[PDB]
Structure formats: structure tokens, C-alpha cells
């Protein structure tokens, strides 16, 4: 009967959404981990909001949960790094490289080295693998398309990607019923204590 509580969380998500409390909706998605919101995710990735992207994801998967979720974080942190290079902040690029990308070195020693060496290029586009890499806006889009596929194939996201179908304002409608049940014992001031006439 825990589907009750779980379902109640969904009702609250829909309520919050209708009332347009946007940040509260996504914290609830994240902390409950019941529903992953692609549309929101894309929006944040396009915006380059990396701390929120990783924070939102962290409610669903860790970096080492599986090879899908590992590539997901790697792609995110990689792009983060390149952006730092592209704005010529080499102090930030190195901080990213040590804190965010190092975990990946253990299982790919060689790739970590190849990534580190991009620090010494005038432009990382001198590397032939990054040769076609253009605009920041465009790079984020390319990477996003891959992230979607990685998330959809990740078994930890199984049944988290599709919102249930509900009539609008189901929570308000149920609340509506409780007031009907309360007064029917009559013959409304509050929702806090049962109503009487």
C-alpha cells in the first residue's frame, strides 16, 4: 500500500506545477526520485547550469551506478571543462579536471591524459577529435541529444520518464471530496480540522 504515498507525491507534483511553484516541483522530483523531468533537464543543460544539473541528477543516480550513468556524468563534466578552457579560465579548468574528471581516470588512464593535455593547446580544436567542435550553444545541444538517449536507456530510469495521466487538479478535487464527506454529516472555515454546521 506504499503506492498510496507514492501516488500522493505525484498529486502534489501536479498541484505544485499548476500553482507554478517551479523550483519546488523540481526539488520534489529530485528528492522523491519518482519522476525525472526531461524538459526541465534540457532547459538546465542548455543554460549551462551545471551545479543544478548534477544536483538534480543526484536524486536519480550516482556516477558509478552503471556504465550509462557513468557516461552521463562524464559527458557533463567534460563539457564543463571545455567551456572553462574556451573562456580561458585555466584555473577553473584545472579545478574541474581534478575534482570532477579524475574519478574517470582509474578506468580510462589514457583518456584522462589526453583530456589533460588540452590545457597546452592554443585551441582544443587543434585536437582532431574536437576538430568539429564549434559554438558553446551548439556543443551543449549535441551533447544533450546523447544524454537523452543515455538516460532513456539507463535501467535506473525505468518507469521514471513518463508522467502518469491525471485529470487537472486531482489533489484539489480530492480535497473537494473531503469537504463533501465532512459536511454531509451536516446539517467551510478551514482544511485544518473537520468541518461542522
Amino acid at each position: 500500500m506504499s503506492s498510496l504515498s507514492r501516488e500522493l507525491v505525484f498529486l502534489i507534483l501536479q498541484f505544485l506545477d499548476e500553482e507554478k511553484f517551479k523550483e519546488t516541483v523540481h526539488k520534489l522530483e529530485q528528492e522523491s526520485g519518482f519522476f525525472f523531468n526531461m524538459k526541465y533537464f534540457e532547459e538546465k543543460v542548455h543554460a549551462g547550469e551545471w551545479d543544478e544539473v548534477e544536483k538534480y541528477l543526484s536524486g536519480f543516480t550516482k556516477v558509478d551506478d552503471n556504465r550509462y550513468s557513468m557516461k552521463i556524468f562524464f559527458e557533463i563534466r567534460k563539457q564543463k571543462y571545455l567551456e572553462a578552457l574556451d573562456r580561458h579560465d585555466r584555473a577553473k579548468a584545472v579545478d574541474i579536471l581534478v575534482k570532477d574528471l579524475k574519478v574517470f581516470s582509474t578506468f580510462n588512464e589514457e583518456l584522462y591524459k589526453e583530456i589533460t593535455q588540452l590545457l597546452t593547446l592554443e585551441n582544443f580544436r587543434e585536437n582532431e577529435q574536437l576538430s568539429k567542435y564549434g559554438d558553446t550553444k551548439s556543443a551543449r545541444s549535441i551533447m544533450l541529444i546523447e544524454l537523452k538517449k543515455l538516460i532513456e536507456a539507463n535501467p535506473l530510469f525505468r518507469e521514471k520518464l513518463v508522467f502518469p495521466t491525471l485529470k487537472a487538479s486531482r489533489l484539489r478535487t480530492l480535497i473537494n471530496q473531503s469537504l463533501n464527506w465532512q459536511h454531509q454529516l451536516c446539517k467551510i472555515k478551514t482544511l485544518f480540522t473537520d468541518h461542522t454546521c
Partner: peptide
Amino acid sequence: DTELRLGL
């Protein structure tokens, strides 16, 4: 899908 890459 931009490089360099660990597979999948």
C-alpha cells in the same frame, strides 16, 4: 557525442 569518449 563530441569527443573524446568512453564508450556506450
